[PDB]
Design an enzyme around this catalytic site. Structure first.
Site, PDB file in Angstrom:
ATOM      1  N   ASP A  10       0.842  -1.202   0.000  1.00 37.62           N
ATOM      2  CA  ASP A  10       0.000   0.000   0.000  1.00 37.62           C
ATOM      3  C   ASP A  10       0.878   1.253   0.000  1.00 37.62           C
ATOM      4  O   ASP A  10       2.067   1.200   0.339  1.00 37.62           O
ATOM      5  CB  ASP A  10      -0.911   0.009   1.246  1.00 37.62           C
ATOM      6  CG  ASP A  10      -1.800   1.274   1.351  1.00 37.62           C
ATOM      7  OD1 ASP A  10      -2.541   1.604   0.396  1.00 37.62           O
ATOM      8  OD2 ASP A  10      -1.770   1.942   2.421  1.00 37.62           O
ATOM      9  N   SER A  11       0.290   2.384  -0.362  1.00 38.20           N
ATOM     10  CA  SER A  11       1.002   3.672  -0.347  1.00 38.20           C
ATOM     11  C   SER A  11       1.379   4.150   1.055  1.00 38.20           C
ATOM     12  O   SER A  11       2.260   4.976   1.190  1.00 38.20           O
ATOM     13  CB  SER A  11       0.145   4.741  -0.996  1.00 38.20           C
ATOM     14  OG  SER A  11      -1.033   4.919  -0.239  1.00 38.20           O
ATOM     15  N   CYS A  73      -4.500  -1.591  -1.722  1.00 37.92           N
ATOM     16  CA  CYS A  73      -4.492  -0.200  -2.178  1.00 37.92           C
ATOM     17  C   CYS A  73      -5.328  -0.151  -3.442  1.00 37.92           C
ATOM     18  O   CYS A  73      -5.102  -0.928  -4.381  1.00 37.92           O
ATOM     19  CB  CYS A  73      -3.059   0.226  -2.495  1.00 37.92           C
ATOM     20  SG  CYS A  73      -2.868   1.836  -3.238  1.00 37.92           S
ATOM     21  N   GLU A 152      -2.625  10.013   7.097  1.00 37.95           N
ATOM     22  CA  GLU A 152      -1.175   9.828   7.197  1.00 37.95           C
ATOM     23  C   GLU A 152      -0.563  10.730   8.298  1.00 37.95           C
ATOM     24  O   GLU A 152       0.399  10.341   8.962  1.00 37.95           O
ATOM     25  CB  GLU A 152      -0.487  10.089   5.846  1.00 37.95           C
ATOM     26  CG  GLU A 152      -0.745   9.038   4.758  1.00 37.95           C
ATOM     27  CD  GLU A 152       0.037   7.746   4.954  1.00 37.95           C
ATOM     28  OE1 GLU A 152      -0.558   6.673   4.746  1.00 37.95           O
ATOM     29  OE2 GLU A 152       1.241   7.781   5.318  1.00 37.95           O
ATOM     30  N   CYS A 184     -10.871   3.802  -0.741  1.00 40.24           N
ATOM     31  CA  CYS A 184      -9.451   3.992  -0.482  1.00 40.24           C
ATOM     32  C   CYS A 184      -9.214   3.339   0.857  1.00 40.24           C
ATOM     33  O   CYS A 184      -9.972   3.559   1.805  1.00 40.24           O
ATOM     34  CB  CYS A 184      -9.101   5.475  -0.404  1.00 40.24           C
ATOM     35  SG  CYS A 184      -7.398   5.834   0.093  1.00 40.24           S
ATOM     36  N   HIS A 186      -7.283   3.751   3.167  1.00 42.64           N
ATOM     37  CA  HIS A 186      -7.045   4.674   4.267  1.00 42.64           C
ATOM     38  C   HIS A 186      -8.324   5.126   4.965  1.00 42.64           C
ATOM     39  O   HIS A 186      -8.288   5.460   6.139  1.00 42.64           O
ATOM     40  CB  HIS A 186      -6.377   5.941   3.765  1.00 42.64           C
ATOM     41  CG  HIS A 186      -4.906   5.841   3.558  1.00 42.64           C
ATOM     42  ND1 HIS A 186      -4.349   5.290   2.426  1.00 42.64           N
ATOM     43  CD2 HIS A 186      -3.874   6.324   4.290  1.00 42.64           C
ATOM     44  CE1 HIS A 186      -3.034   5.403   2.488  1.00 42.64           C
ATOM     45  NE2 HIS A 186      -2.720   6.023   3.613  1.00 42.64           N
TER      46      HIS A 186
HETATM   47 CL   LIG Z   1      -6.166   4.694  -3.497  1.00 39.66          CL
END
Ligand SMILES: [Cl-]
Ligand SMILES: [Cl-]
Ligand SMILES: [Cl-]
Lengths: 266, 266
Positions: A10-11, A73, A152, A184, A186
């Site tokens: 994942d990012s 992700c 984040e 997403c 997140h």
């Molecule tokens: Cl994404």
């Protein structure tokens, strides 16, 4: 060691929303996680570059040794899942199809909303996947560029988080949408705020639980489930700073003695 | 070219799994084969059941199927692994999905399994459950009267309430928080079982998770049909077409269906 990890990429911290559900549903399985925090956000990047990064992350975990890969992700799934599944021999899945299954199970009136990054919304992967399952479902998507930074930065429980959700999601209240996909990985870190804002009439879907079931399903299918009492050693890797990652991870996961390491990709 | 999802069962129970596939995969045609002439399978030879199961599989493979669900719990214990190896299409049963679904729903890891005397004696559920999570506590309870309450249609009435209260009474003395309906007939009794057990217990219709795995596996192989236009379901029985139709058309809400009588084996 006999235990082989399931890999997650994942990012940043998003993929932890799948990991939590894997810890629940598959407690004997070891997790290797990679968050590319330093090149976050992936949202505004082109498809080619996202795929290139997803491959760097994939090659990193394949080298460490994994028996399966979860592209945890959404934009990475859209950009690179088919190519990665094709080229590797281990099972590979993404998060778009499970969230689509979950949403179509939760809806009462077949009006589904999708929240995502710019890359994800522009890919049209969600509407395509949803209508490919049920061609009569209505699907409307809403980009939320600010959500990833707020998560984040670790501000996702705070008063500013409440405001940015209220501002971003206001348009949904003009529609009759009864189910909202957190498209997403997140966004489930904002889920309590999103649910309060939207109220009890809208089911807000965290795709992690359905993704974890599919991990369980495929492992069970191919006899890849771990049958050992070897001690579980979960490993987390980030391209950014380890303490910030630990502070978010330890809040989302119930895991005080977490091993987090900083690595390089390029 | 359009290929069906195959289902094989000893009788009508498996239609409860077909029902969830109709909900979750409305573009897909289903071929269902119920071997009513030779049910119940529960008290039959383990080897003989494999022969019957193979005969049903071969029948459906001859008619072009891209996926096989073995809805019969005795069938899946006796020949699932062998059938996967020989065929070149995905094959699954309902036991692993039910178990997977129970592990998602349980909060205290105390699970009950309801089923036929044969199913609960096989330990198929505990075996599958502990393969995923070795700390889970599992109590198994035969419910001999349930299959008749369902086939006869008495599930629709107050008489079914007493039978459920009688059979499931031992469970109120346990701290079980999840109950797996480990016979495909039992979902017709789910509302009655939920009322009896109360809000603290999740009751699992294993058809739901089974249908999701069917969706996931088709998607893995890029075998999900985008279109709904040319659907032509087929329902086959070795027993009474009329008795089967009368049940099936209620459960599947499909007044215009046709049921074809077939001959299997000696
Ligand atoms: Cl994404
Ligand atoms: Cl974005
Ligand atoms: Cl059954």
């Amino acid at each position: 060691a006999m235990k082989q990890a399931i890999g997650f990429i994942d990012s940043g911290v998003g993929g932890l929303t799948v990991v939590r559900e894997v810890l629940k549903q598959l407690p004997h399985e070891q997790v290797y996680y990679l968050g590319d925090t330093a090149r976050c956000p992936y949202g505004p990047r082109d498809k080619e570059e996202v795929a290139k990064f997803t491959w760097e992350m994939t090659n990193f975990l394949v080298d460490r040794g994994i028996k399966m890969l979860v592209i945890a992700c959404n934009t990475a799934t859209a950009a690179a899942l088919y190519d990665i599944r094709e080229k590797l021999d281990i099972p590979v899945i993404g998060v778009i199809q499970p969230g689509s299954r979950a949403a179509l199970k939760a809806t009462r009136n077949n009006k589904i909303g999708v929240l995502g990054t710019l890359g994800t919304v522009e890919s049209m992967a969600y509407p395509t996947a949803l209508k490919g399952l049920n061609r009569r479902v209505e699907v409307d998507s809403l980009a939320c560029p600010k959500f990833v930074s707020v998560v984040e930065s670790g501000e996702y429980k705070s008063a500013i988080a409440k405001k940015v959700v209220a501002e971003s999601l206001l348009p949904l209240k003009s529609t009759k949408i009864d189910t909202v996909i957190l498209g997403c990985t997140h966004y489930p870190l904002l889920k309590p705020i999103i649910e309060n804002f939207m109220g009890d009439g809208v089911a807000v879907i965290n795709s992690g639980e359905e993704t974890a079931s599919e991990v369980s399903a495929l492992l069970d299918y191919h006899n890849l489930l771990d049958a050992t009492d070897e001690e579980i050693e979960h490993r987390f890797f980030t391209t950014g700073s380890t303490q910030i990652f630990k502070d978010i991870a330890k809040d989302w996961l119930n895991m005080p003695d977490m091993t987090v390491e900083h690595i390089k990709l390029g």
